[PDB]
Amino acid sequence: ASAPIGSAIPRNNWAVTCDSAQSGNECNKAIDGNKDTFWHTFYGANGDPKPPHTYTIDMKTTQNVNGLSVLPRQDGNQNGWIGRHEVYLSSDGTNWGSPVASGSWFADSTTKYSNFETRPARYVRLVAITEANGQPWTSIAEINVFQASSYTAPQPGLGRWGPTIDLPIVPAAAAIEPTSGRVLMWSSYRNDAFEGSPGGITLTSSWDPSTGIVSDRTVTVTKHDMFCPGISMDGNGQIVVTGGNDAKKTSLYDSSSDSWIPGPDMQVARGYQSSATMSDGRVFTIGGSWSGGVFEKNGEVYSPSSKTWTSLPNAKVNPMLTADKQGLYRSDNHAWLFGWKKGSVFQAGPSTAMNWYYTSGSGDVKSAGKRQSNRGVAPDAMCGNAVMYDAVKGKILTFGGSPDYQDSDATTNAHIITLGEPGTSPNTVFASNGLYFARTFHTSVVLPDGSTFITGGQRRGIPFEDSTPVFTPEIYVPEQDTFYKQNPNSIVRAYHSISLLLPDGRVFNGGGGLCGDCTTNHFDAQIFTPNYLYDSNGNLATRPKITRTSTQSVKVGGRITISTDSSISKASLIRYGTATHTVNTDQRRIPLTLTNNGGNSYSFQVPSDSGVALPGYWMLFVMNSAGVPSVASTIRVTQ
Ligand SMILES: [Ca+2]
Ligand SMILES: [Cu+2]
Numbered sequence: 001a002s003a004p005i006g007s008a009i010p011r012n013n014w015a016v017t018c019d020s021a022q023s024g025n026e027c028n029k030a031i032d033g034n035k036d037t038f039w040h041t042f043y044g045a046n047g048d049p050k051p052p053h054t055y056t057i058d059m060k061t062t063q064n065v066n067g068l069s070v071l072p073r074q075d076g077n078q079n080g081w082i083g084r085h086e087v088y089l090s091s092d093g094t095n096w097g098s099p100v101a102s103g104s105w106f107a108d109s110t111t112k113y114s115n116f117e118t119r120p121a122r123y124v125r126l127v128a129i130t131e132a133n134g135q136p137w138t139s140i141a142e143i144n145v146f147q148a149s150s151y152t153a154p155q156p157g158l159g160r161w162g163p164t165i166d167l168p169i170v171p172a173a174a175a176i177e178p179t180s181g182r183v184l185m186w187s188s189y190r191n192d193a194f195e196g197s198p199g200g201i202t203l204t205s206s207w208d209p210s211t212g213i214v215s216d217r218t219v220t221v222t223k224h225d226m227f228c229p230g231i232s233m234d235g236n237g238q239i240v241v242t243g244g245n246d247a248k249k250t251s252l253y254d255s256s257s258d259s260w261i262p263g264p265d266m267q268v269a270r271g272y273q274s275s276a277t278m279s280d281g282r283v284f285t286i287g288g289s290w291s292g293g294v295f296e297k298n299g300e301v302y303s304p305s306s307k308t309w310t311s312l313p314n315a316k317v318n319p320m321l322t323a324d325k326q327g328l329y330r331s332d333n334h335a336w337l338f339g340w341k342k343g344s345v346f347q348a349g350p351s352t353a354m355n356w357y358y359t360s361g362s363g364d365v366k367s368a369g370k371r372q373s374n375r376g377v378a379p380d381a382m383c384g385n386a387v388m389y390d391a392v393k394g395k396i397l398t399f400g401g402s403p404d405y406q407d408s409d410a411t412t413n414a415h416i417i418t419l420g421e422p423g424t425s426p427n428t429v430f431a432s433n434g435l436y437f438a439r440t441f442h443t444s445v446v447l448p449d450g451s452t453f454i455t456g457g458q459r460r461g462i463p464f465e466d467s468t469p470v471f472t473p474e475i476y477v478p479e480q481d482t483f484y485k486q487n488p489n490s491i492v493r494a495y496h497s498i499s500l501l502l503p504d505g506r507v508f509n510g511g512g513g514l515c516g517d518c519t520t521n522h523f524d525a526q527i528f529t530p531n532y533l534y535d536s537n538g539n540l541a542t543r544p545k546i547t548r549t550s551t552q553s554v555k556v557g558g559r560i561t562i563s564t565d566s567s568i569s570k571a572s573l574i575r576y577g578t579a580t581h582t583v584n585t586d587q588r589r590i591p592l593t594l595t596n597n598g599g600n601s602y603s604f605q606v607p608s609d610s611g612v613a614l615p616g617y618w619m620l621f622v623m624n625s626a627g628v629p630s631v632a633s634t635i636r637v638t639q
Pocket of ligand 1 (some may be wrong): 142
C-alpha cells in the first residue's frame with residue numbers, strides 16, 4: 001500500500017462541509033471512524049451533479065499538517081473513487097492559495113495519500129476534480145489528516161520544496177520527453193509491484209509541468225516490463241530502454257510521437273545494467289546480472305540506423321566488477337558510464353577500478369587507474385552517483401554509495417575525476433571535504449550554473465525500508481569546491497527514487513519503494529526550486545528571456561546566434577536526463593563560450609567533438625548577472 005509522513009490528527013471535534021451529500025451518506029460519515037460508513041455526493045432523486053466535488057475540514061486549531069489520506073468505500077462499489085485532485089491549506093478558511101499537492105490517484109479501492117511539506121493550517125480542503133473512471137460521484141469512507149511533530153520555516157536562500165505531485169504509480173524510472181517538456185515515468189507490470197510479473201506490460205504515467213496534468217498509459221505494444229532497465233537517449237532522439245523484468249527486450253520511446261516502438265532483442269539478457277549513448281549516437285551497455293542470469297555479461301552495442309545489437313565480447317566486464325559480498329548478482333550493476341571521444345565509454349565506478357571501454361571491432365577495455373585522492377584509494381561505491389558537470393573540461397563529480405549494494409554503510413566520499421583522451425589515466429582528487437551526509441540510493445542532477453544538486457538516499461542501504469533517511473539535500477559548487485546544505489524535505493527518497501532537471505530549471509524528485517504490499521511505496525514526486533530562481537526577498541526572480549534563436553538543430557561544431565531581452569553573463573547546454581536506480585547516463589553540461597555581438601545578441605559554438613557534445617536533445621540556458629537562468633530552449637545536436 002503506502003503511508004503518511006505524519007501521525008493522525010484526532011477528529012472528534014472537527015467540523016466538515018461538502019459540496020453535496022446524500023441522506024445517510026452525510027459529509028461527517030467520512031470522519032466517524034467507521035470503515036463501513038461513507039460520505040457520498042448527490043445521486044438518484046437529487047440528480048447526479050458532476051465533479052469537481054469538495055471536502056473541507058475545520059480542525060478548529062492550528063496543526064502542523066503534512067498530509068492526508070482517503071479510504072474508499074469498502075462494499076465493492078467502485079463509482080466514487082477520486083481521480084484527479086488538489087489539496088489546499090488555509091489559516092482563515094477563505095484564502096486557499098496554490099495547492100500543496102495535486103495529481104491523480106490510481107483507480108482502485110486502496111487507501112490513497114497526499115504527502116507534502118509541513119505547513120501550519122487550521123483548514124484542509126480536498127478537491128476531487130474527476131472521479132477515477134469519469135463518473136459523476138465522489139465518495140469517501142474515511143478521511144484523515146496527518147501532522148508532523150514540529151514545524152520549521154525554510155531558511156532564506158536555501159531553495160524551496162513543493163508542491164507534491166500525486167501519482168497513480170511509483171515512479172522508479174523516469175525521463176524528460178524533450179519535444180513536449182513532459183516528465184515520463186514508469187513502474188512495472190503493476191503500479192507498485194514488480195514481483196511475480198508475467199512480463200510484457202509496463203505501467204507509465206506522465207506529468208506536464210505546464211498544465212499540472214497527470215496522465216497514465218498501459219504499454220504492451222513493446223511486450224516489455226521495463227522495470228530495472230538500462231536507459232539511454234540515442235542519437236536518433238529515441239530513448240532506448242533495455243532488459244529488466246523482460247531481460248532481453250529493447251523498447252524505444254519516441255518523444256516526437258509520444259509513443260513506444262519495439263526494438264531488437266539484446267544479445268545478452270540483462271537487468272540493472274547501465275547503458276550509455278556514444279559519440280556516434282549508438283548505445284553501449286555492459287553488466288546487469290539482476291535478471292537474465294548471473295554470469296559475465298560483457299559489452300554490446302546498439303545501432304539505431306541498422307536496428308541491431310552486436311556483442312562486444314572483448315569489452316570485458318571483469319575489470320569493472322565491485323567486490324560486493326553478494327557476488328556477481330550485484331557487482332556488475334549500475335556502472336557509472338559516460339560516452340566519450342571516438343566511440344569510447346568511460347567507467348568511473350562504482351568499482352574502485354576505473355576503466356576505458358572501446359567499441360571498435362569486438363571491443364576492448366583498458367585500466368584507467370583507481371578512483372583515489374591524497375586521502376587514499378576510494379572504496380567500492382555501489383549506488384553512488386556520478387555527474388559530468390563540465391563536459392568540455394572532462395569533469396565528473398562522484399559521491400556517496402556503499403561498498404555493498406545493501407546492508408552496508410554509505411559514505412561521504414566524493415571525488416572530481418578529470419577526463420583527458422581515451423586510454424589515459426585521469427587525474428582524481430577529493431571533492432571539498434566530502435558530503436555533509438553519507439548516503440546511498442540518492443539521486444542528483446547538474447544545474448544550469450554547473451552546480452550539482454544531490455538529494456535523498458539513506459545512510460545504510462536497505463532496499464524497500466525508509467530507515468536512516470537523509471532529508472537534507474546538498475549542492476556542490478565547483479568554483480568554490482564547496483558543498484552547501486539546502487532546505488530539507490519530509491518524504492524519504494531512497495531505493496527506487498529518481499531526480500531529473502526540468503526545462504524550467506527546477507528539479508523533479510520522486511519515487512521510492514515499489515515493493516507491492518509494503519508500506520514504503522511513494523506514489524508521488526516533489527519539486528525543488530533552487531535559490532537561483534529567488535530574489536533577495538524570497539520572491540520568484542525575473543528571468544532573462546531568449547527571444548530568438550538562429551536555429552534549433554545544429555551539428556557538432558556548429559554555431560547558434562541568440563537574442564535576449566536583457567544582458568546575460570553565462571550560458572550552458574544541459575543534455576536532457578533519464579533516471580533509474582541512481583543511474584543517469586544521459587545528463588551532462590557544456591559551459592558555453594559566448595561572443596557578444598552587442599544589442600543583447602550573442603553567439604556560441606557547440607563543441608566539435610561529439611564525445612563531449614553527445615548527440616541528442618539539449619537544454620539551452622542563459623543566465624544574467626544576478627545568476628538567474630532563463631527557462632530552457634530545446635536544441636537538437638546532431639553528428
Ligand atoms: Ca466512515
Ligand atoms: Cu530495483
